[PDB]
Design an enzyme around this catalytic site. Structure first.
Site, PDB file in Angstrom:
ATOM      1  N   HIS A  40       0.925  -1.217   0.092  1.00 52.82           N
ATOM      2  CA  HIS A  40      -0.050  -0.150  -0.065  1.00 52.82           C
ATOM      3  C   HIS A  40       0.902   1.222  -0.037  1.00 52.82           C
ATOM      4  CE1 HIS A  40      -0.022   1.738   4.192  1.00 52.82           C
ATOM      5  NE2 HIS A  40       0.283   0.319   4.523  1.00 52.82           N
ATOM      6  N   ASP A  84      -0.110  -7.331   1.903  1.00 55.26           N
ATOM      7  CA  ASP A  84       0.310  -6.252   1.870  1.00 55.26           C
ATOM      8  C   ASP A  84       1.911  -6.253   2.306  1.00 55.26           C
ATOM      9  OD1 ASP A  84       0.569  -3.510   1.830  1.00 55.26           O
ATOM     10  OD2 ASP A  84      -0.406  -3.099   3.950  1.00 55.26           O
ATOM     11  N   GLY A 175       2.018   6.759   8.629  1.00 56.68           N
ATOM     12  CA  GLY A 175       3.060   7.422   8.457  1.00 56.68           C
ATOM     13  C   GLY A 175       4.268   6.423   8.766  1.00 56.68           C
ATOM     14  N   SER A 177       3.528   3.274   8.117  1.00 57.20           N
ATOM     15  CA  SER A 177       3.079   2.496   7.094  1.00 57.20           C
ATOM     16  C   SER A 177       4.244   1.492   6.271  1.00 57.20           C
ATOM     17  CB  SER A 177       2.323   3.059   6.084  1.00 57.20           C
ATOM     18  OG  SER A 177       1.077   3.370   6.625  1.00 57.20           O
ATOM     19  N   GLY A 178       4.634   0.460   6.111  1.00 62.31           N
ATOM     20  CA  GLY A 178       5.817  -0.217   5.558  1.00 62.31           C
ATOM     21  C   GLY A 178       6.950  -0.364   6.197  1.00 62.31           C
TER      22      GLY A 178
END
Ligand SMILES: [Ca+2]
Length: 223
Positions: A40, A84, A175, A177-178
């Site tokens: 994402h 994801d 923020g 994320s990942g």
């Protein structure tokens, strides 16, 4: 990261910031040329920023390297967030040192109750918005599959796990994320999703990295 603490400069040497003119996502360095992040987080024009603490100040340990290719998981579903995960290759190999270092992939999946370190430059507020500029850290346990599924009926797949605190107050957020979830020196999770941040009975949901080790290794071996 909500309810966390300041990690300390370069104390999480595998943590990267993905930059497209601004920080937009976290990532984890898994060897000198490759970063693991969330699907994402996919976009074009990515620069990988390694050795960062304050993302708004050049402090002397950074390496900025443009991505040459990004590979989203073949079965990523952007609606359900299943699978994801994405890989990003660097145009040149990073110079590895004490402050810029890879993190090991798991050889087996982690269990509920295992304590992990979650990190990132995301929002630090559960209500409202404040972005820190130095890296924030949170220690959090992996939750049972049953409590994870109870928290999010109909949404938890075999490629996801929950970590954090059902009481609320401590979570990853927008923020982050990942970014990494590291447990006993292995990258077990990727910051994926959650309902708001640090809300009661709504723990963080993370991509289950151990399910993807074969794909990661095979992809790296041919790209
Ligand atoms: Ca910096």
């Amino acid at each position: 990261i909500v309810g966390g603490y300041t990690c300390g400069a370069n104390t999480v040497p595998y943590q990267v910031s993905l930059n497209s003119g601004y920080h937009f996502c976290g990532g984890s360095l898994i060897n000198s040329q490759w970063v693991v992040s969330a699907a994402h987080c996919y976009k074009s024009g990515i620069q990988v920023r390694l050795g960062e603490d304050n993302i708004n100040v050049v402090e002397g340990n950074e390496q900025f390297i443009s991505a040459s290719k990004s590979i989203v998981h073949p079965s990523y579903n952007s609606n359900t967030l299943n699978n994801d995960i994405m890989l990003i290759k660097l145009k040149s190999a990073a110079s590895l040192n004490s402050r810029v270092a890879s993190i090991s992939l798991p050889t087996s999946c982690a269990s509920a109750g295992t304590q992990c370190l979650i990190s990132g430059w995301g929002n630090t507020k559960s209500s409202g918005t404040s972005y820190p500029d130095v890296l924030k850290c949170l220690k959090a346990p992996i939750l049972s599959d049953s409590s994870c599924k109870s928290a999010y009926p109909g949404q938890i797949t075999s490629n996801m796990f929950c970590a954090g605190y059902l009481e609320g107050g401590k979570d990853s957020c927008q923020g982050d994320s990942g970014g990494p979830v590291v447990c006993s020196g292995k990258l077990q999770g990727i910051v994926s999703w959650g309902s708001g941040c640090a809300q009661k009975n709504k723990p963080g949901v993370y991509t289950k990295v151990c399910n993807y080790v074969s794909w990661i290794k095979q992809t790296i071996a041919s790209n």
